[PDB]
């Protein structure tokens, strides 16, 4: 089955190259600069032109352009009833059906960035009127880097982007958070980092492997009167926790805003 | 070689598995309650007992009791010059001299609660008179659970508790924090825990992959007028990094007061 990719950026890469591993899929990458195609073909081996071929109702195509690129990218393109999904933000589903001429098989995608890396965690949404086998071929795809989410909601799409979209940005802030106070304590930049990255690494993969409730592993190991219950008392009074909800719903709001840009 | 536990409590048993895993060592666990012996002889399959026996120097002894019961536990045991490591916290080197009665063979440990499954980090302090084999020991004992950091001055052991040795719950704080954010984005408790354990998965593994800087690759993925600056620019206002520099603050004053509760 051919998964054609309407852009050769970041997120067709990564999902390309997620498709690959898993194996049984033929690749197929328009992308009008030659630069980047040049990249694809020695890394991935994959297919590439600058135009898209004639399109079959037994294709997927990925749309996978920046936003304000998409109506232009979309503009002349016959799917031919293909499979669509979308990786682009701020774009619904009916601004995608009209950017491409009237059809319904879509399925919108919210991923983000560590699926470059296999640990990806994907939003989906396809309209009622998208077969439940449409909806299983796309949640295989998008399953090659990483976690799905499926949403009853195209709103909860806004949500994705507040939590997992942007949150590895948010998890990039904290590791410095913690590799600047661990500086300020006296250790030098390697030492820091290094403190910083296996702190996050191995209370992670402690939440995980118990599956316990983060909050119910904190107080496990914040004895009163003791080291832990100082630090944790600072973040509260400092409201630390409610902060990171407030940049969320800021983060929400604005992602609200610019999908406003296009319909 | 001889590795023999005084205390067979959670960081005794997570050396010991850790030292099982790697293979060669002989464990034996004091551990004066039946009930926990029971546990480490089902589950590890080492040696335990009440109390020690005669040890020597050609031994190693691991002191882990809790560090109020630490002068009791070390009143009449002769160590025989064995090679001592402690994992005690706020407890000194002189201090444990102390109360073993003067020998100087001392290696101290700060480890942390991932080292329960491999992945902890461990401060290690020893004074000048401790020969490099003595550290080179105690150090492939404490890389039986994770990473070692070698410190030049016993008092950034308190910088270790504040940074490696609390972390870990500043880590389950900020996991339920974005939880949190994300049922307030209208998520059930499921993809609530989900989304907020694999954005912190995933970013902290793409983080350990590239080796970049925190702060390059936050910015790297934080476009101006964008979602993603919504957040971090909420996260400024708010302070969040300084707060978590000033909860590692009072965690590290806190440390520092307790262990002048035995010195
Ligand atoms: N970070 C996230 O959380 C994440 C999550 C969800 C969605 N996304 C989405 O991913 C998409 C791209 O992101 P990115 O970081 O991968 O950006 P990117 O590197 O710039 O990729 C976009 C590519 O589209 C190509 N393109 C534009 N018009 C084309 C045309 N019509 N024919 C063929 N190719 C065309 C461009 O190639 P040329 O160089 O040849 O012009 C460009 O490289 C966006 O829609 C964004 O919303 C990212
Ligand atoms: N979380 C961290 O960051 C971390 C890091 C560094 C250090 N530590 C240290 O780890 C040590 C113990 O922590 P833990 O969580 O493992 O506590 P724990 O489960 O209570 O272990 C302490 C054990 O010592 C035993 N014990 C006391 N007196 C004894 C005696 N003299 N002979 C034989 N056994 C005796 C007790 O066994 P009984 O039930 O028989 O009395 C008890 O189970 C502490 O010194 C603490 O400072 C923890």
């Given at each position: 089955?051919?998964?054609?990719?309407?852009?050769?950026g970041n997120?067709?890469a990564?999902?390309?190259?997620?498709?690959?591993?898993?194996?049984?899929?033929?690749?197929?990458?328009?992308?009008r600069?030659?630069?980047?195609?040049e990249?694809?073909?020695?890394?991935?081996?994959?297919?590439?032109?600058?135009?898209?071929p004639e399109?079959?109702?037994?294709?997927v195509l990925?749309?996978?352009?920046?936003?304000?690129?998409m109506?232009?990218?979309?503009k002349?393109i016959?799917?031919?009833?293909?499979?669509?999904?979308?990786?682009?933000?701020?774009?619904?589903?009916?601004?995608?059906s009209?950017?491409?001429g009237?059809?319904?098989?879509?399925?919108?995608?919210?991923?983000?960035?560590p699926?470059?890396?296999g640990?990806?965690?994907?939003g989906?949404?396809?309209?009622?009127e998208?077969?439940?086998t449409d909806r299983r071929?796309?949640?295989?795809?998008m399953?090659?880097?990483?976690?799905?989410?499926?949403?009853?909601?195209?709103?909860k799409?806004?949500?994705?982007?507040?939590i997992?979209?942007?949150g590895?940005a948010?998890?990039?802030?904290?590791?410095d958070?913690?590799?600047?106070?661990?500086?300020?304590?006296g250790?030098?930049?390697?030492?820091?980092?290094?403190?910083?990255?296996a702190?996050?690494?191995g209370?992670?993969?402690?939440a995980?492997?118990?599956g316990?409730?983060?909050?119910?592993?904190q107080k496990?190991?914040?004895?009163?009167?003791?080291?832990?219950h100082?630090?944790?008392?600072a973040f509260?009074?400092?409201?630390?926790?409610?902060?990171?909800?407030?940049?969320?719903?800021?983060?929400?709001?604005?992602?609200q805003?610019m999908?406003?840009?296009?319909?």
């Open positions: 089955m051919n998964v054609y990719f309407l852009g050769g997120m067709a990564a999902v390309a190259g997620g498709l690959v591993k898993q194996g049984g899929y033929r690749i197929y990458i328009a992308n600069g030659a630069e980047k195609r990249r694809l073909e020695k890394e991935l081996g994959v297919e590439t032109s600058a135009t898209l399109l079959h109702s037994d294709d990925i749309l996978a352009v920046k936003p304000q690129d109506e232009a990218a979309c002349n016959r799917t031919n009833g293909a499979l669509v999904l979308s990786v682009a933000a701020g774009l619904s589903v009916g601004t995608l009209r950017y491409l009237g059809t319904r098989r879509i399925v919108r995608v919210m991923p983000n960035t699926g470059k890396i640990l990806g965690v994907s989906m949404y396809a309209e009622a998208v077969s439940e071929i796309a949640d295989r795809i399953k090659s880097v990483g976690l799905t989410v499926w949403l009853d909601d195209e709103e799409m806004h949500g994705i982007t507040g997992s979209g942007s590895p948010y998890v990039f802030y904290l590791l958070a913690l590799q600047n106070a661990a500086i300020r304590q250790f030098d930049m390697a030492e820091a980092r290094a403190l910083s990255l702190t996050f690494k209370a992670v993969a402690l995980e492997q118990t316990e409730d983060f909050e119910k592993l496990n190991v914040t004895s009163k009167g003791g080291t832990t100082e630090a944790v008392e509260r009074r400092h409201r630390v926790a409610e902060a990171i909800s407030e940049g969320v719903c800021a983060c929400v709001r604005r992602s805003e999908e406003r840009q296009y319909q």
